[PDB]
Design a protein around this nucleic acid. Structure first.
Lengths: 76, 78, 204, 149, 120, 129
RNA sequence: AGAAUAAGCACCGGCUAACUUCGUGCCAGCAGCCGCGGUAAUACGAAGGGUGCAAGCGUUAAUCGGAAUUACUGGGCGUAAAGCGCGCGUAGGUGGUUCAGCAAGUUGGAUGUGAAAUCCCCGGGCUCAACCUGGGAACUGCAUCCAAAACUACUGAGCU
RNA sequence: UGGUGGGGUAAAGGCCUACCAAGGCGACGAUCCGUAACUGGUCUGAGAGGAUGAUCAGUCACACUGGAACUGAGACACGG
């Protein structure tokens, strides 16, 4: 219930996209690779700038390609 | 529609039943909700007749499932 | 089962095979002094894989077994846990084709395999007619009560202490009924086989 | 050892200005049933002498392979030239499951469940080399560690 | 070749192309004889062999070898094709099977009767 | 450049094992010092010798057998590239268990015998055999 | 009632331990790799015998295998195939050194599952085997949860 | 691709809509191009795997071809 990513684009109101990165293993190659995942997060008040770190929550979808809202700015 | 029902496994001229809990939306031998214990009317030495467990059989009668016609008079063998 | 004339099969091996036709001898009139085939007045190059063949192609020619049936019996040796060679000849001695003669109701396996198909040898009060039943340690072995005055059953009771006792059964000669006591190990067998060298004819 | 096993014959030629004269080399191994393996071949004209001109050095260079008793010491990683050899011990019931020249050297050592392999070159001239360097460094206890385990 | 370079561009197993352009994973494929004629073997041997040209029902123009020691495949037969590459004949990879539909069968041919088309 | 601290020490002693030198000195870390302490307890080396000055160094005193010395090879498994994070059920019994198979865990950079009887797996570091 | 109603196929030059001749003569042909046939043919056509395993035996086709012959396990590159002619360096891969912190990767346990089938063992039954099921085993997986801090990333102050 | 006003679906949602802004996707392979139902599984394999989806079971999809609703609890309905 906690997904964390760094802010990469904020030029739209009430909506922000982050890179929820991870590092997981390749199945037949063994080397742990990074796999970037670019979610969309909904902001209620639009207070997130590029380079911020946030956590998010799942609910009913807020738009097309958006089903995750803003919980809290963890750090900056 | 929810129903406890005899369902043919086994071989031809070799009946074996499962007593599936089904939906009556599916076939006899596919997509059962639950298998409670079996039946075997070709039961000979060493083979138990029916593995009817009343721990789960209460629940579908409690949640509203029905015997078909024969399933009522397998519970009458108790 | 293999059929036909059988004096010509006693010549390739050198052993008596327990394949005969009477009650006095074997390879004593059917001229066993050579190595047959197409042309066999000369020998040469008698070595490993063709010997591993002549091992299994002897064991095939004794026990009434086909390679449909016999290389499925190597399949249970790996299904057996450990010691695959002697555990092959376990099921050839839980075989009923051999143990009618290992008791001695028939003259050979060629009369043992035959009469059990002719509804003679029951197992445990049932009606079994297969030459492949797997006798457990501790059933009776009886004869159906219409082949008792079959007198070629009485033409086999003379070789009990003449082909030697097996010392693994306890039989009643008056009833013509026996009892298989237990399974053998590799001390109760004839020493003409190589049990873990039939095994080596599996990968090549 | 008297439990010799022939590995390979191979028909060698060489040329004189008169013509081609042929010679036979033949490699055999010699073990004792308990683990002293040897190597060698001979250069002669004929078949039945080139296997006992192999015995000329096969009883020589015999070294006691440090067995455990019917089972090999370790999973093995070994090589000579362009041949590489893998081995590992087996448990109880399987017999000879090595191949070609690997079943000759690993059957005269007293171990029977062998499970040996050939990688790189398959030349039996250089194959029997990597097998004995697989058996030259066997030790259950002969490490200099001040500990039994 | 390294594991980094494997995640970038993995090792593709190269496919083996099949030997028969026709017989598209089919054990037999019927044809119609365009031309039967005579062909010489390759140089270290010498003989006279008789091959056929067929159009198949896949519409393909390949040569099949009439494997008999005698045949009446009279220029428009309905011959059936197996694979297998005859070594001494260059460039051809098919055989006409014997006793199929219009292939009459080799005279006596008293051993291997399942090969060269003989009853009993 | 140098890219791995402890693979640089595990190479530099093996060519000294086939050379005639005894005391090996290199600029060392705590990572290389925690590895060195466990195999002197397995009878392979002795007296790791933190120099305890600025630019601290390790003087590992490796023992000789008569002729060929005690450690044939040290095979790196988890190098830095493919780094072999392995569980407790899948620990390598290297040479029948005569390799001690040191595996970095939370409660200690420790051999495979104590890694299984107190079950934590992780970085399977190197062959010690 | 009575042996009356039942066997066939392919090969036999090699590395397959099934291995005389008769006809044919670089002809006719066979064959998977070598090859065989150019006049005593164990290689090709019969007969004459064996042998493979059997109501099936063979060969056409397709799949994986041996194939370390796409090598993560587990390969290569001076001359066999293979180092761009070499730089600056973007993403990226990996990153000297110490304490502390985080708990993403890593590690253990917990719980829901991972449907049933199939498979793997113990069985029960068909007179036996298939087949049939009962019991479990298996399902290396997935997220959640708490516990761990040697190492990696990340975070901060540094050390040369 | 977002934002709100409304409109609408049994139900969230540019799904539909007007207007406001210039965002969105993509070198971890977008878009285009060729190919194919998918999976439990199956077959060869020491395993890793590789090949693979006939009977069996789950889900999907279609009903001469295409568009479309209607009725109904449930369809954009194989013998409507």
């Amino acid at each position: 219930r906690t997904l964390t990513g760094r802010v990469v684009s904020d030029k739209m109101d009430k909506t922000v996209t982050v890179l929820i990165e991870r590092r997981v293993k390749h199945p037949i190659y063994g080397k742990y690779v990074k796999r970037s995942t670019k979610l969309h997060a909904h902001d209620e008040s639009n207070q997130c700038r590029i380079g911020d770190l946030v956590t998010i929550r799942e609910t009913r979808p807020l738009a097309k390609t958006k089903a995750w809202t803003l919980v809290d700015i963890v750090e900056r | 529609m929810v129903t406890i029902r005899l369902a043919r496994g086994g071989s031809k001229k070799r009946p074996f039943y499962h007593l599936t809990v089904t939906n009556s939306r599916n076939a006899r031998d596919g997509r059962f909700v639950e298998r409670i214990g079996f039946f075997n009317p070709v039961a000979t030495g060493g083979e138990v007749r029916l593995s009817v467990d009343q721990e789960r059989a209460t629940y579908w009668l409690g949640q509203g499932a029905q015997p078909s016609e024969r399933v009522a008079q397998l519970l009458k063998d108790a | 089962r293999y059929i036909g004339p059988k004096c010509k099969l006693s010549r390739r091996e050198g052993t008596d095979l327990f394949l005969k036709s009477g009650a006095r001898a074997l390879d004593s009139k059917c001229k066993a002094e050579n190595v047959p085939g197409q042309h066999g007045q000369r020998r040469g190059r008698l070595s490993d894989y063709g010997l591993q063949l002549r091992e299994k192609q002897k064991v095939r020619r004794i026990y009434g077994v086909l390679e449909r049936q016999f290389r499925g019996y190597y399949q249970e040796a790996s299904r057996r846990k450990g010691s695959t060679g002697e555990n092959l000849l376990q099921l050839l001695e839980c075989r009923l084709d051999n143990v009618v003669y290992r008791m001695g109701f028939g003259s050979t396996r060629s009369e043992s395999r035959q009469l059990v198909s002719h509804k003679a040898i029951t197992v445990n009060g049932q009606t079994v007619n297969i030459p492949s039943y797997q006798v457990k340690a501790g059933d009776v072995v009886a004869v159906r009560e219409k082949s008792k005055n079959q007198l070629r059953i009485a033409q086999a009771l003379e070789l009990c202490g003449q082909r030697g006792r097996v010392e693994w059964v306890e039989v009643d000669l008056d009833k013509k009924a026996g009892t298989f006591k237990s399974a053998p190990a590799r001390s109760d067998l004839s020493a003409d086989i190589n049990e873990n060298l039939i095994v080596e004819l599996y990968s090549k | 050892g008297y439990i010799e096993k022939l590995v390979q014959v191979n028909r060698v030629a060489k040329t004189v200005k008169g013509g081609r004269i042929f010679a036979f080399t033949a490699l055999t191994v010699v073990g004792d049933g308990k683990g002293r393996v040897g190597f060698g071949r001979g250069k002669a004209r004929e078949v039945p002498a080139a296997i006992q001109k192999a015995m000329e050095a096969a009883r020589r260079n015999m070294i006691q392979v440090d067995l455990n008793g019917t089972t090999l010491q370790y999973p093995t990683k070994s090589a000579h030239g362009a041949s590489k050899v893998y081995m590992q011990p087996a448990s109880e019931g399987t017999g000879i499951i090595a191949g070609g020249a690997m079943r000759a050297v690993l059957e005269v050592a007293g171990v029977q469940n062998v499970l040996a392999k050939c990688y790189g070159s398959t030349n039996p001239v250089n194959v029997v080399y990597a097998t004995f360097k697989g058996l030259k460094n066997m030790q259950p206890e002969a490490v200099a560690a001040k500990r039994g385990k | 070749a390294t594991i980094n370079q494997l995640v970038r561009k993995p090792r593709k197993r190269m496919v083996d192309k099949s030997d028969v352009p026709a017989l598209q994973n089919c054990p037999q494929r019927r044809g119609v004889c365009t031309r039967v004629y005579t062909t010489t073997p390759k140089k270290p041997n010498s003989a006279l062999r008789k091959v056929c040209r067929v159009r198949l029902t896949n519409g393909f123009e390949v040569s099949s070898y009439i494997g008999g020691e005698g045949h009446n495949l009279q220029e428009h037969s309905v011959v059936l094709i197996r694979g297998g590459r005859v070594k001494d004949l260059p460039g051809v990879r098919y055989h006409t099977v014997r006793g199929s539909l219009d292939t009459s069968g080799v005279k006596d041919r008293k051993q291997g009767r399942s090969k060269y088309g003989a009853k009993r | 450049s140098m890219q791995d601290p402890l693979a640089d020490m595990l190479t530099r002693i093996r060519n000294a094992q086939m050379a005639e030198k005894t005391v090996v000195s290199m600029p060392s870390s705590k990572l290389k010092a925690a590895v060195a302490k466990v195999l002197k307890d397995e009878g392979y080396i002795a007296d790791f010798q933190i120099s305890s000055e600025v630019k601290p160094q390790l003087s590992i005193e490796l023992k000789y057998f008569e002729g060929k010395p005690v450690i044939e090879e040290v095979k790196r498994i988890s190098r830095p590239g493919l780094r072999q994070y392995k569980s407790v059920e899948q620990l390598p019994a290297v040479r029948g268990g005569l390799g001690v198979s040191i595996v970095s865990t939370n409660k200690g950079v420790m051999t495979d015998r104590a890694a299984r009887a107190a079950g934590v797996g992780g970085e399977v570091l190197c062959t010690v055999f």
